[PDB]
Design a protein around this ligand. Structure first.
Ligand code: CLA
Ligand code: CLA
Ligand code: CLA
Ligand code: CLA
Ligand code: CLA
Ligand code: CLA
Ligand code: CLA
Ligand code: KC2
Ligand SMILES: CC1=C(C#C/C(C)=C/C=C/C(C)=C/C=C/C=C(C)/C=C/C=C(\C)C#CC2=C(C)C[C@@H](O)CC2(C)C)C(C)(C)C[C@H](O)C1
Ligand SMILES: CC1=C(C#C/C(C)=C/C=C/C(C)=C/C=C/C=C(C)/C=C/C=C(\C)C#CC2=C(C)C[C@@H](O)CC2(C)C)C(C)(C)C[C@H](O)C1
Ligand SMILES: CC1=CCCC(C)(C)[C@H]1/C=C/C(C)=C/C=C/C(C)=C/C=C/C=C(C)/C=C/C=C(C)/C=C/C1=C(C)CCCC1(C)C
Lengths: 172, 35, 180, 45, 34
């Protein structure tokens, strides 16, 4: 009785415990792997994308003076060589060791998936506000993971940055 | 030549130290008549 | 229930408030599988070794003893310049301090066999560890300085290996990595 | 020429290895009853 | 000067645990088939 797809039945383990659940698990990935590990991944991919989308937009409008001006994707290449790339990899890796410890905790059931307990500015006042926001994040992560993939492929073809392409559509 | 020499020195020093400290580990007590 | 340092994870069981410097950061849980007294003795000894060492890298650059070969500003370079025998004489003197300080009980099983709360090798010449409250807070400082020094010495050693320059000098006349 | 040591690096094995083993022996030594025996050899081990 | 008793695993078990960090980390047990 999946709500999102009336026809298909709700996948057995998608019961709405995690927020963002519309029963959309057509290919049944839920049954094969632990749902908790998957939510961790949904949000972790989403979080990179929700940031990257901001970056393609910001990198286009402005770049710091010390770096040469380049299109957003081009930079994956200059930075592989200037060595900035390694730094951004070293740190994101360091944060992730703690992430392996965090996951193992989720598997032992002692951590809600996706919770690093970071709410510095304390925006989440109430358990409802957390449910409102928590859903919003899951929706944005899903939109963003789609959009970042778009910004990149459209550039691989148009060879135009996203805001420039919007200005000059330059249809194939 | 230096690397072979340092490897040989490491090996010889290890075995000689093992021999020396093994015979220092109350070797006379390792007899069947010890109680 | 939760570590203070890492809120997401659980408080490492072994860590309770009693050891000093305990904000619960043992994510990989070494505490569960080794003796905290052995571990603390090492957290302290590496720091005490790198409080002397970090100060050493800075002092050597500014001032060097009159004897020949004690003249290389870069610590890493100096190790080679100084006479080798002297470096071994230092090794041995330190080695004696080890055996006498630990009383010959120098192994994981026996070092703490008699008393010896970790790191109490007895050096309190000016008694400052008489107040307990004072001792509990000085002990946090030593660990916080030991932990920073460890990180600092590694940084200075690696940054010198690239720059062939002592820490203070590299900050002056800093050049990007490509130049070196 | 003192031990055939023409390169200082040769002295790192000649010292660290005997010390390390000695460290293993020190634990054996601390476990022994080290009071004096009036005998030809010490049977305590 | 806290001195916990540590009635726990031996040193060899700790070394084996540290090695299991690099040959058997909890990374892949999160994804387990049912
Ligand atoms: C914790 C301290 C720390 C240290 C010592 C370093 C070390 C470095 N980083 Mg890595 N980095 C860090 C944290 C650190 N990073 C953090 C928290 C991030 C964010 C994830 C990064 C992400 C990162 C990027 C993207 C880059 C570096 C760069 C640098 C290098 C600058 C070299 C230079 O010539 O100075 C520059 C001179 C000044 C800053 C003048 C003062 C240096 C090797 C750059 C690099 O790799 O150059 C090859 C670089 O592009 N860092
Ligand atoms: C929502 C996602 C999405 C996206 C990003 C695209 C993107 C694209 N489609 Mg497309 N399409 C979509 C959904 C989508 N479509 C759907 C749902 C259908 C109906 C099933 C189609 C049916 C369709 C046809 C029939 C054709 C395209 C074509 C194209 C390309 C035209 C390039 C251009 O300048 O047009 C810019 C578009 C506008 C200015 C409007 C472009 C890459 C054309 C192609 O292959 O390129 C030559 C083409 O012939 N699409
Ligand atoms: C040789 C260094 C060393 C040693 C033996 C210890 C030992 C200890 N620390 Mg300390 N600590 C250190 C360095 C060290 N620490 C540094 C550098 C920092 C700053 C980041 C801290 C910050 C810190 C905090 C905030 C706390 C401790 C605590 C503890 C105790 C329990 C945790 C434990 O068993 O970790 C054992 C640690 C090791 C065996 C060293 C890790 C070796 C790995 C394999 C390599 C290190 C590289 C690492 C991955 C990063 C590079 C990339 C124990 C007495 C807790 C405590 O006081 O409880 C009583 C506590 O709350 N430590
Ligand atoms: C980890 C500690 C450490 C290590 C391994 C070294 C190693 C070295 N030092 Mg450095 N040094 C250190 C700490 C250290 N130092 C500190 C803390 C100071 C500040 C006083 C200095 C000041 C210093 C100078 C001024 C010079 C060296 C030099 C040297 C080299 C030759 C050895 C020598 O003459 O030492 C001389 C070092 C001392 C006389 C200081 C030792 C003081 C100890 C470490 C502190 C003990 C205090 C303690 C409370 C007493 C406890 C009593 C019981 C050698 C590479 C020489 C060199 O080649 O430099 C280019 C040189 O000219 N050192
Ligand atoms: C005759 C010389 C001599 C002797 C007999 C001793 C005797 C002793 N020392 Mg040593 N020490 C000496 C000289 C000496 N010291 C000198 C000159 C220094 C430098 C100033 C030190 C520095 C030192 C430190 C820093 C420590 C000791 C410790 C000890 C005690 C335990 C020994 C042991 O089991 O280690 C046997 C040898 C080993 C186990 C090998 C060392 C282990 C390696 C180096 C760890 C590598 C970790 C790795 C890099 C991190 C992973 C990275 C990640 C990316 C994977 C013992 C009382 C330890 C102690 O008290 O523990 C409670 C301790 O922590 N000593
Ligand atoms: C106390 C910490 C400390 C500090 C202040 C510095 C200082 C510095 N380091 Mg050293 N570094 C340290 C220790 C430290 N390092 C450690 C622990 C290591 C690992 C062993 C190194 C690794 C390292 C390398 C390999 C070198 C740098 C370099 C640099 C420079 C570039 C830093 C940068 O742009 O980071 C970028 C970081 C940011 C802009 C964001 C940081 C935000 C938070 C606060 C962190 C800078 C002057 C370079 C150098 O000295 O000359 C090129 C260089 O090659 N650092
Ligand atoms: C033949 C010896 C051997 C054996 C029995 C194992 C067994 C295992 N490894 Mg592997 N592993 C080995 C050698 C071995 N490894 C070697 C030599 C390497 C490379 C140095 C790896 C690299 C490796 C990685 C990268 C990962 C495992 C993981 C795992 C565990 C997977 C099951 C799980 O998710 O829980 C399992 C216990 C995974 C895991 O999650 O561990 C808990 C994991 O992420 N292993
Ligand atoms: C704090 C650790 C330490 C201790 C406890 C200690 C004790 C004694 C005693 C016992 C009381 C004697 C008798 C003695 C004698 C000499 N020491 Mg000394 N010494 C220590 C440290 C260093 C360093 C770091 C160096 C050094 C030197 C010499 C030389 C010069 C040789 C020469 O004339 O060329 C001679 C004769 C230098 C060196 O050997 O250079 C080749 C040199 O770098 N020592 N030393
Ligand atoms: C957590 C935490 C904190 C925090 C925080 C942060 C950092 C929050 C940051 C949140 C962000 C940045 C969310 C961003 C979402 C981005 C989205 C949804 C992108 C949508 C793009 C779309 C729909 C598109 C598109 C497009 C496509 C694909 C291609 C184009 O041709 C067309 C088009 C333009 C239509 C703080 C300290 C504040 C407080 C706290 O105590 C704890
Ligand atoms: C000055 C002197 C020089 C020398 C000097 C010599 C003596 C240098 C002495 C050096 C040594 C002893 C410094 C040790 C540093 C270790 C630090 C950085 C720690 C990392 C542990 C932290 C990050 C951790 C964390 C961990 C926590 C605790 C618990 C875990 O669950 C989690 C985690 C794994 C994350 C030389 C000889 C070159 C010559 C020079 O002329 C003069
Ligand atoms: C050099 C060479 C030549 C000279 C002589 C010689 C003997 C031949 C030799 C000397 C050699 C020796 C002395 C060289 C070896 C040297 C030094 C002492 C190694 C230091 C390593 C520091 C590591 C990378 C730390 C990273 C700190 C972490 C990120 C802090 C993490 C933190 C925790 C986890 C969490 C909270 C906050 C954050 C900040 C995130």
């Amino acid at each position: 009785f999946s709500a999102a797809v009336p026809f298909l039945k709700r996948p057995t383990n998608l019961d709405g415990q995690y927020i963002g659940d519309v029963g959309f698990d057509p290919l049944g990935f839920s049954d094969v792997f632990d749902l908790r590990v998957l939510r961790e991944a949904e949000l972790k991919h989403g979080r990179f994308a929700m940031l990257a989308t901001l970056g393609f937009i910001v990198q286009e409008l402005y770049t710091f003076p010390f770096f040469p001006k380049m299109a957003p994707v081009d930079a994956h290449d200059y930075f592989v060589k200037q060595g900035g790339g390694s730094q951004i990899i070293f740190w994101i890796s360091f944060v992730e060791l703690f992430g392996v410890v965090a996951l193992f905790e989720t598997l032992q059931g002692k951590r809600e998936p996706g919770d690093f307990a970071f709410d510095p500015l304390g925006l989440a006042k109430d358990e409802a506000t957390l449910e409102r926001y928590r859903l919003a994040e899951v929706k944005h992560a899903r939109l963003a993971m789609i959009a970042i993939g778009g910004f990149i492929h459209q550039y691989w073809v148009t060879k135009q940055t996203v805001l420039e392409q919007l200005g000059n559509f330059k249809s194939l | 030549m230096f690397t072979l020499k340092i490897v040989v020195y490491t090996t010889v020093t290890l075995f000689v130290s093992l021999f020396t400290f093994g015979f220092l580990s109350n070797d006379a007590s390792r007899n069947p008549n010890r109680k | 229930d939760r570590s203070y340092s890492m809120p997401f994870l659980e408080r490492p069981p072994a860590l309770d408030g009693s050891l000093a410097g305990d904000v619960g950061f043992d994510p990989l849980g070494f505490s569960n599988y080794f003796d905290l007294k052995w571990l603390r003795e090492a957290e302290l000894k590496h720091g005490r070794v790198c409080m002397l060492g970090c100060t050493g890298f800075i002092t050597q650059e500014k001032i060097q003893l009159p004897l020949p070969g004690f003249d290389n500003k870069v610590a890493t370079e100096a190790f080679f310049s100084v006479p080798a025998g002297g470096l071994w004489q230092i090794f041995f003197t330190l080695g004696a301090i080890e055996i006498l300080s630990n009383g010959g009980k120098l192994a994981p099983g026996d070092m703490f066999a008699d008393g010896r709360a970790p790191g109490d090798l007895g050096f309190d010449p000016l008694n400052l560890s008489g107040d307990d409250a004072a001792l509990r807070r000085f002990i946090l400082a030593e660990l916080k300085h030991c932990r920073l020094a460890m990180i600092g010495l590694g940084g200075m050693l690696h940054q010198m290996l690239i720059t062939k320059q002592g820490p203070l000098d590299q900050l002056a006349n800093f050049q990007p990595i490509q130049y070196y | 020429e003192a031990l055939g040591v023409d390169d200082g690096r040769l002295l790192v094995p000649l010292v660290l290895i005997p010390v390390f083993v000695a460290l293993l022996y020190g634990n054996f030594a601390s476990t022994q009853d080290n009071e004096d025996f009036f005998d030809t050899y010490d049977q305590r081990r | 000067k806290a001195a916990p008793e540590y009635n726990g695993p031996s040193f060899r078990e700790g070394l084996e645990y540290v090695f299991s960090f690099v040959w058997k980390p909890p990374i892949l047990i999160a994804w387990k088939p049912r």
